[PDB]
Design a protein around this ligand. Structure first.
Ligand SMILES: [K+]
Ligand SMILES: [K+]
Ligand SMILES: [K+]
Ligand SMILES: [K+]
Ligand SMILES: [K+]
Ligand SMILES: [K+]
Ligand SMILES: [K+]
Ligand SMILES: [K+]
Ligand SMILES: [Mg+2]
Ligand SMILES: [Mg+2]
Ligand SMILES: [Mg+2]
Ligand SMILES: [Mg+2]
Ligand SMILES: [Mg+2]
Ligand SMILES: [Mg+2]
Ligand SMILES: [Mg+2]
Ligand SMILES: [Mg+2]
Ligand SMILES: [Mg+2]
Ligand SMILES: [Mg+2]
Ligand SMILES: [Mg+2]
Ligand SMILES: [Mg+2]
Ligand SMILES: [Mg+2]
Ligand SMILES: [Mg+2]
Ligand SMILES: [Mg+2]
Ligand SMILES: [Mg+2]
Ligand SMILES: [Mg+2]
Ligand SMILES: [Mg+2]
Ligand SMILES: [Mg+2]
Ligand SMILES: [Mg+2]
Ligand SMILES: [Mg+2]
Ligand SMILES: [Mg+2]
Ligand SMILES: [Mg+2]
Ligand SMILES: [Mg+2]
Ligand SMILES: [Mg+2]
Ligand SMILES: [Mg+2]
Ligand SMILES: [Mg+2]
Ligand SMILES: [Mg+2]
Ligand SMILES: [Mg+2]
Ligand SMILES: [Mg+2]
Ligand SMILES: [Mg+2]
Ligand SMILES: [Mg+2]
Ligand SMILES: [Mg+2]
Ligand SMILES: [Mg+2]
Ligand SMILES: [Mg+2]
Ligand SMILES: [Mg+2]
Ligand SMILES: [Mg+2]
Ligand SMILES: [Mg+2]
Ligand SMILES: [Mg+2]
Ligand SMILES: [Mg+2]
Ligand SMILES: [Mg+2]
Lengths: 100, 117, 48, 55, 110, 150, 142
RNA sequence: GUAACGGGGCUAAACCAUGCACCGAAGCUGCGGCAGCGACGCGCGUUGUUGGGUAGGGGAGCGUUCUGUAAGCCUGCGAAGGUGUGCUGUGAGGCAUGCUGGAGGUAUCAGAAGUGCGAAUGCUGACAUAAGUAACGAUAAAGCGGGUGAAAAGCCC
RNA sequence: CCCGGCGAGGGGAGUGAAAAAGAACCUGAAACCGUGUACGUACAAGCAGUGGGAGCACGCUUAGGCGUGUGACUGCGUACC
C-alpha cells in the first residue's frame, strides 16, 4: 500500500515504515505530524485533488542540514568571482499509518 | 615584522588540489591548472543544479507519455484530462506510478479520459 | 580593568585600504586607479 | 619544428609501449658439458654440440 | 621473509635500467640470473650484481635457500643527476644531465 | 643594496624579461621595495587626556578594591626576605608599591621580586597601575597623586 | 525518492517484425527509431537501450512521395579529394535496398555509442524472409 | 565535401485561416534558508520590499608574523612544521583527531605590519617535455695473435 | 660477517632514545619519476568537467541500505589572465 502527499512544495509517494526526507517542518523530533491532504491512496483512490478521509501519520525522526553545496560564480576576464556555501535544512519523518 | 608566506600558501594550494582529485593530468597535480579546473567545476555545478530540474522533468514527461500512449492517450491530452479532473499529482509521481504501478496509472488515465469525454 | 580588557571606542579605528590584494577586497588588480592613463601610473598625476 | 604543447606522461608511456625487451625464450643445454648456452653459440667453457671446440 | 639488495647511485638512467628490471620481475632467481646473463645491456650487468647480492644476503643473513627464492619486487628509482656543461656552436652552453638510478631487488620465498 | 648600476642585459633581442638593475626588488638579493627606516613611534598624549586617563584608572582601582592605602610602607634593612614576608602578611604578591619618596632599602628589597615594583608618586604610569594586580599607596603618595591630578 | 532508472543487465527487449511494403519511408523510420530507442516504454531511460529488436521485411518495397524515387539523392564522401559520390533513391533501391531504411533510421537515432548500439537491434531485409524465427518476432503494424 | 530546411526525413512534418491542448527560462508560483533597506511595534518580533554587475564608491570580516596581556596558559604523557581523516561556518576560514615530527607553541582583548600571488617574455632554485631522439668534432683505416685485468675494438707487446 | 672488482653500493651485526639521525646525515612540502593494488579503458571524436548513472571492488550499525574508490553509458559544456 502507498499514498501520495504534498509537503514542502513537493510530492512524496510513501508506504508505512518508510523514512522520508522533507523540507524542514517546525515540529520537534518524536512529535507526530499528520498529512491530511493526500493526493492518492493505492491498496486505487485518486484525489480530486485530495482523497476524502485520507490521512498519512508520521513521526518526526530527525532534523538536520543536508550536504554542503558550493556556489561558485565567476565572470571570466571581468575580475569577478564569488563563492558561497549552502546546507539545506531537512526533516526526516517515518510514516506510521495511511488511512482513507 | 617580516611575514613568510609558506605555511599559508601551502594550505591554500592544498585546499584547491584536494578539490581537484580525480581530474586528468595537470588538473589534479598542478595548482595553476587545478585552480581553473576547480572554478570551472563550480560554474558547471551551479548551472547544473538548474539543469537537473529541467532534465528530470523532461525524463518524467517522456515516461508519462509512453505510459499514457500504452493506455491509448497522448501526454498532452492526459495532462489536460487530469487538470480538468482536478488531479494535482505531479510529473515525478506520475512517472514513478507509470513504472511501478501500471494499474494505478491506468486508473489515472481512465480518470483523465472521463474528464475530457 | 586589565591590559587584555581595554577596547578602543567603536568607530575610532577604521582599517586602512590595502590595494592590490585580490578580487574579494574590492581594490584588487588596478587598486582603484581604473585603466591606464597618467593617473594610473606610479607618480602619475598633474600638478595643482 | 617543435611541439606547441607539452606531451603528457600518458603519451610518453604509449610511445614506450614498444620499448620492452624480449628475454631469451630458452637457453640450449650442451649434450656433454650440460652447460646452458645461446642456441647455435658455443658455451662459456668452449663446447658446441657436445664437442670441445675452443680452449 | 623478504631480503633486499640495492645499488644506489648506479650510473644509468632509470629508464634504461627499468627495461632490464621488467624482464625479471616475478621470476624465480635461477631463471632471472639466466635472463640477465643473455641480456645484452649494461643495465643487465648492474641488475645482475644487485640480484646476486640479494640472493647472498638472503642465504647468509636470512637463512634462505636460493632454489626457493623469487624476484618478488624489483624497481628502479631516479637518483641524483650530475649536472655538466656541453659546449654547443656559437658560444651556447647546454646542460648535460648524467642521470643515476637506485636499483632495488627484493627476493623472497613467498 | 651593494652592486653595480650596470643593466644586466640589453633591452631588446635576448628573449628575456627586460632588466635594469640587479638590485630590483623583483630579484632575489634585490632591494626591499619599501625598505624600513628607523621610526619614532611616540604619540602625543594631550596633558588633560593623560591626567583624565590616570583619574579613570585610579577610580577603577578603588571600585575594583585594587588600591590599598597605608600610612607607611617600609622595610628595616635592604633585604628581599623582609619585603617578601611583609607582602605575604598583607595577602600581596603582585603589587605596585607607591611611596612619597625614593627609599633606598625598600627599592633594593623589591628589586629581585619580579611581581613587585616600588615607585615614588612622581613615577606612576597608566600601564603599571593596570598591569599590577594590587596597588599599595602610602597616604603621602595619595596626597602627591591628588596634587598631581587636581 | 530517486527517479527510476532502467538497468542494461535487466532490460526486457522484445522482437518485432514489420513489413515495409508500401510504407512511407520517413513515417516508418520515425516509428522504428522510437521503438529502437525504447521511447514507447515507461522504463525509457536516455542513457540505456530500453528498445526492441525490429526486423524490417520488404525494404525494396518502401514508398516515397512526390518525385523522390528519382530526385532524392544520397551523398557520401570517400575521404579522397574530389570523392563526392551520389546515388538516387531508385539507384539505392536497385543496388542496396536495405541501406535506404538503415540510413533513414540512423539519422533519426541519437548520435554516439548508445545510438550505434540502438541501431544494431534493427534487422533490415530486402525481401519477405528472415533467419530469426528462433527469436519469435511478433507482427508489428505501422 | 552533400553544403542555400541544423540533420534525418517530410506531400505535410509546407503554406493560409480558425480553435483547443501541451512543451518550454535562473521569468512567475510553491516549500525551506540567508542578507540589505524601510516601516509598525516592543537588540529582539511582525510586516513591506530589495539582493546580475566592470570601472569605481561604501560597509563588514578571515588568516599570517611580530608587541603587550604572559615568570600566565598548552607542551617529551609529544610543541611548531609535514601528511591523512572527520566535523563545522555564508566566505576568507575554524575545530578535532590518526600517522610523521622531536621542542617548542600561545588563548583572550588590544597593538604594529616586510600581512595573503597564477600571471609581470617577473627573480632564484628544483624538476619536466621534446627523447633515450640529434649527436659523439675532419671519410688517414684498420686486422689478428699474445699479455694484464672483474671486464679489453680502444691499454701493453 | 656476507655479496661485490682487496670497488661503488648494499644486507646483517653493533652504537644510540631514534640510523626511515649513517655523515649525499634535524624536519623533509611540491613539481617530477616509479612499484603494488582496486576500478575503468582497444567501434571511439573536441577545455576533459559537470548533472544523471549502471556495473565492479572494498568496508560498514535497518540486514539492510549506506559509505569509499572507480566510472560503462548519457544531457550540458570552446581554459585562465
Ligand atoms: K579611486
Ligand atoms: K652584490
Ligand atoms: K622588582
Ligand atoms: K603534529
Ligand atoms: K597574544
Ligand atoms: K611567473
Ligand atoms: K627523455
Ligand atoms: K558526461
Ligand atoms: Mg620572522
Ligand atoms: Mg597527487
Ligand atoms: Mg569594483
Ligand atoms: Mg592594466
Ligand atoms: Mg583608455
Ligand atoms: Mg583614468
Ligand atoms: Mg617611475
Ligand atoms: Mg599558440
Ligand atoms: Mg621506442
Ligand atoms: Mg668559441
Ligand atoms: Mg637583501
Ligand atoms: Mg609634556
Ligand atoms: Mg545532441
Ligand atoms: Mg560540389
Ligand atoms: Mg524551471
Ligand atoms: Mg526569480
Ligand atoms: Mg535579481
Ligand atoms: Mg550585487
Ligand atoms: Mg605574543
Ligand atoms: Mg608582501
Ligand atoms: Mg608560486
Ligand atoms: Mg592575477
Ligand atoms: Mg630543458
Ligand atoms: Mg642508440
Ligand atoms: Mg622525433
Ligand atoms: Mg632518427
Ligand atoms: Mg645518428
Ligand atoms: Mg673522433
Ligand atoms: Mg668498470
Ligand atoms: Mg686484441
Ligand atoms: Mg680505434
Ligand atoms: Mg699497438
Ligand atoms: Mg662498504
Ligand atoms: Mg623518520
Ligand atoms: Mg656530509
Ligand atoms: Mg634536535
Ligand atoms: Mg633528513
Ligand atoms: Mg561502426
Ligand atoms: Mg569497447
Ligand atoms: Mg581523440
Ligand atoms: Mg556537447
Amino acid at each position: 500500500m502507498y499514498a501520495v502527499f504534498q509537503s514542502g512544495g513537493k510530492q512524496h509517494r510513501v508506504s508505512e515504515g518508510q523514512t522520508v526526507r522533507l523540507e524542514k517542518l517546525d515540529i520537534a523530533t518524536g512529535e507526530t505530524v499528520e498529512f491530511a491532504e493526500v493526493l492518492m491512496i493505492a491498496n486505487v483512490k485518486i484525489g480530486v485533488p485530495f482523497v476524502d478521509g485520507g490521512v498519512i501519520k508520521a513521526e518526526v525522526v530527525a532534523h538536520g542540514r543536508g550536504e554542503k553545496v558550493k556556489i561558485v560564480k565567476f565572470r571570466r576576464r571581468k575580475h569577478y568571482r564569488k563563492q558561497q556555501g549552502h546546507r539545506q535544512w531537512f526533516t526526516d519523518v517515518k510514516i506510521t499509518g495511511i488511512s482513507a | 615584522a617580516r611575514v613568510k608566506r609558506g605555511v599559508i600558501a601551502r594550505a591554500r594550494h592544498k585546499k584547491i588540489l584536494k578539490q581537484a582529485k580525480g581530474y586528468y593530468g595537470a588538473r589534479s597535480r598542478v595548482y595553476r591548472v587545478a585552480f581553473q579546473a576547480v572554478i570551472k567545476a563550480g560554474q558547471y555545478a551551479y548551472r547544473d543544479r538548474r539543469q537537473r530540474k529541467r532534465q528530470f522533468r523532461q525524463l518524467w514527461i517522456a515516461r508519462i507519455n509512453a505510459a499514457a500512449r500504452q493506455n491509448g492517450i497522448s501526454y498532452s491530452k492526459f495532462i489536460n484530462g487530469l487538470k480538468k479532473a482536478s488531479v494535482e499529482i505531479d510529473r515525478k509521481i506520475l512517472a514513478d506510478i507509470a513504472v511501478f504501478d501500471k494499474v494505478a496509472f491506468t486508473a489515472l488515465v481512465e480518470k483523465a479520459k472521463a474528464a475530457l469525454a | 580593568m586589565r591590559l587584555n580588557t581595554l577596547s578602543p571606542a567603536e568607530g575610532s579605528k577604521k582599517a586602512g585600504k590595502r590595494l592590490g590584494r585580490g578580487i574579494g577586497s574590492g581594490l584588487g588588480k588596478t587598486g582603484g586607479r581604473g585603466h591606464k592613463g597618467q593617473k594610473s601610473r606610479s607618480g602619475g598625476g598633474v600638478r595643482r | 619544428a617543435v611541439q606547441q604543447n607539452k606531451p603528457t606522461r600518458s603519451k610518453r608511456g604509449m610511445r614506450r609501449s614498444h620499448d620492452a625487451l624480449t628475454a631469451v625464450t630458452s637457453l640450449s643445454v650442451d649434450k656433454t658439458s650440460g652447460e646452458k648456452h645461446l642456441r647455435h653459440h658455443i658455451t662459456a667453457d668452449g663446447y658446441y654440440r657436445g664437442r670441445k671446440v675452443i680452449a | 621473509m623478504e631480503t633486499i639488495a640495492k645499488h644506489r647511485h648506479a650510473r644509468s638512467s632509470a629508464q634504461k635500467v627499468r627495461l632490464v628490471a621488467d624482464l625479471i620481475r616475478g621470476k624465480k632467481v635461477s631463471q632471472a640470473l639466466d635472463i640477465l646473463t643473455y641480456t645484452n645491456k649494461k643495465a643487465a650487468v648492474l641488475v645482475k650484481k644487485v640480484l646476486e647480492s640479494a640472493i647472498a644476503n638472503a642465504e647468509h643473513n636470512d637463512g634462505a635457500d636460493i632454489d626457493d627464492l623469487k624476484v618478488t619486487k624489483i624497481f628502479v628509482d631516479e637518483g641524483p643527476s650530475m649536472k655538466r656543461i656541453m659546449p654547443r656552436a656559437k658560444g651556447r652552453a647546454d646542460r648535460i644531465l648524467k642521470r643515476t638510478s637506485h636499483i632495488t631487488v627484493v627476493v623472497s620465498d613467498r | 643594496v651593494t652592486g653595480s648600476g650596470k643593466k644586466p642585459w640589453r633591452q631588446k633581442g635576448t628573449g628575456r624579461a627586460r632588466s635594469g638593475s640587479i638590485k630590483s626588488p623583483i630579484w632575489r638579493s634585490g632591494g626591499v621595495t619599501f625598505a624600513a627606516r628607523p621610526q619614532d613611534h611616540s604619540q602625543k598624549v594631550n596633558k588633560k587626556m593623560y591626567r583624565g586617563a590616570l583619574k579613570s584608572i585610579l577610580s577603577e582601582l578603588v571600585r575594583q578594591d585594587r588600591l590599598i592605602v597605608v600610612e607607611k610602607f617600609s622595610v628595616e634593612a635592604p633585604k628581599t626576605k623582609l619585603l617578601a614576608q611583609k607582602l605575604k602578611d598583607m595577602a600581596l604578591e603582585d603589587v605596585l608599591i607607591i611611596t612619597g619618596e625614593l627609599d633606598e632599602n625598600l627599592f633594593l628589597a623589591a628589586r629581585n621580586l619580579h611581581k613587585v615594583d616600588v615607585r615614588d608618586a612622581t613615577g606612576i604610569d597608566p600601564v603599571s597601575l593596570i598591569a599590577f594586580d594590587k596597588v599599595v599607596m602610602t597616604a603621602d603618595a595619595v596626597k602627591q597623586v591628588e596634587e598631581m591630578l587636581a | 525518492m530517486k527517479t527510476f532508472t532502467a538497468k542494461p543487465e535487466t532490460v526486457k527487449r522484445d522482437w518485432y517484425v514489420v513489413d515495409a511494403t508500401g510504407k512511407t519511408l520517413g513515417r516508418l523510420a520515425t516509428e522504428l527509431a522510437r521503438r529502437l530507442r525504447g521511447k514507447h516504454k515507461a522504463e525509457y531511460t536516455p542513457h540505456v537501450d530500453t528498445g526492441d529488436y525490429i526486423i524490417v521485411l520488404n525494404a525494396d518495397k518502401v514508398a516515397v512521395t512526390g518525385n523522390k524515387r528519382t530526385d532524392k539523392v544520397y551523398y557520401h564522401h570517400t575521404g579522397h579529394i574530389g570523392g563526392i559520390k551520389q546515388a538516387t533513391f531508385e539507384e539505392m533501391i536497385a543496388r542496396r535496398p536495405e541501406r535506404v531504411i538503415e540510413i533513414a533510421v540512423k539519422g533519426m537515432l541519437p548520435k554516439g555509442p548508445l545510438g550505434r548500439a540502438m541501431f544494431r537491434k534493427l534487422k533490415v531485409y530486402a525481401g519477405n524472409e528472415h533467419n530469426h524465427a528462433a527469436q519469435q518476432p511478433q507482427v508489428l503494424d505501422i
